[PDB]
């Protein structure tokens, strides 16, 4: 179960910043000290307990980018499952970025045409708040007209930044496109939701704290998953100060955050506030071996 993810972009696009924050556990202020990635940096990251991710943090500078599509084209773009192209909105060479993306799409269509393309419009915190979404539209349409040209009828894009929680949503949806047996996880989560009579049950990953699945797939915030992921990353970094690891968290006897297994974390919001804690904890412990 080896998944080959490519992480490409232009110079200074922030690819290694995403790789460090999501997986290597770096803060937002600690990405300024990062150097320039030379050629391709490989990272073998173990997701859940069975998945292994071969993330290829590519260079992004002009010599490396010209080298990718001429000499190493038979190596970087073969047996590829997911491409993640990072577009910087601070770039003044947007047409060159679109041409680089077109060459990457052409190579992927030539070699491994079953892959999944994702685009992240990074550094979307320097732009003013009023012109963000429209800008995300204005590029994306063009990218769609590019993406449908070289095969690939579908292309999913995300307005991302390292100073908010959108990175977690983008990376969660990128990673979840590779997780096997998602239907079984959804069915078991629905069964547990019916059994415990819970308002919403969300299943994460323990290390990266990315969302894996949700019970639902009073109006609630549509961006609650990424906010909970950011809050849990902050709480893990806070609990590292006490020389220990986070295990459980009970809020108002209504919100239970529990270590479901050695690779997942469950976030259960129930309906009745009068349930004793031990019954919910026991039912959590019974389902610990079920999701394994």
């Amino acid at each position: 179960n080896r998944k080959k993810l490519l992480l490409m972009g232009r110079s200074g696009s922030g690819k290694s910043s995403m790789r460090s924050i999501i997986f290597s556990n770096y803060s937002a202020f600690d990405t300024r000290r990062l150097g320039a990635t030379i050629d391709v940096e490989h990272s073998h990251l173990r997701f859940l307990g069975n998945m292994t991710l071969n993330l290829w943090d590519c260079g992004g500078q002009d010599v490396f980018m010209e080298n990718y599509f001429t000499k190493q084209k038979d190596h970087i773009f073969q047996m590829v499952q997911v491409l993640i192209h990072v577009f910087d909105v601070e770039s003044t060479e947007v047409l060159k970025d679109i041409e680089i993306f077109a060459k990457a799409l052409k190579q992927l269509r030539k070699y491994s045409p079953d892959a999944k393309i994702f685009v992240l419009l990074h550094k979307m915190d320097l732009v003013q708040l009023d012109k963000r979404e429209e800008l995300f539209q204005i590029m994306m349409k063009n990218l769609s007209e590019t993406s449908s040209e070289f095969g690939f009828p579908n292309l999913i894009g995300f307005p991302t930044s390292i100073w908010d929680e959108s990175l977690y949503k983008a990376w969660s949806q990128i990673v979840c496109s590779l997780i096997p047996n998602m239907s079984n996880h959804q069915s078991n989560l629905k069964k547990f939701k019916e059994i415990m009579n819970a308002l919403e049950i969300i299943l994460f990953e323990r290390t990266t704290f990315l969302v894996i699945c949700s019970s639902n797939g009073v109006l609630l915030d549509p961006k609650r998953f990424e906010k909970i992921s950011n809050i849990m990353k902050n709480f893990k970094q806070s609990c590292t100060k006490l020389k220990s690891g986070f295990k459980t968290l009970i809020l108002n006897n209504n919100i239970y955050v529990s270590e479901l297994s050695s690779n997942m974390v469950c976030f259960i919001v129930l309906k009745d506030m009068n349930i004793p804690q031990e019954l919910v904890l026991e039912n959590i412990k019974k389902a610990k071996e079920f999701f394994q």
Binding site: N188, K191, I195, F290
Partner: protein, 95 residues
């Protein structure tokens, strides 16, 4: 008027010390939980004996059957009938 404020401050000091003493008196440690001694084995006869001890010889001398035999059985049946509790469904659900 400031002497009245001094007396008010003295009363406030006494009241705050009384509040501290009152909230200090209800603190229960785990040693108090483990060795409480409140939970003691009690029977009806021992409770009646303790009640008579706090309130304060062979009295009985050795000398119908149908009515007593009917009433005892009816009382036992009425006791056993109301103790029958029917569950509203299964207690443990499978996967």
């Amino acid at each position: 008027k400031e002497h009245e404020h001094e007396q008010k401050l003295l009363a406030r000091e006494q009241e705050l010390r009384d509040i501290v003493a009152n909230t200090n008196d209800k603190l229960i440690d785990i040693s108090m939980i483990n060795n409480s001694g409140i939970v003691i084995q009690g029977t009806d006869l021992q409770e009646a004996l303790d009640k008579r001890q706090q309130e304060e010889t062979n009295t009985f001398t050795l000398l119908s059957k149908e009515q007593l035999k009917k009433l005892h059985s009816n009382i036992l049946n009425e006791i056993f009938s109301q103790s029958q509790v029917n569950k509203p469904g299964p207690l443990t659900v499978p996967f």
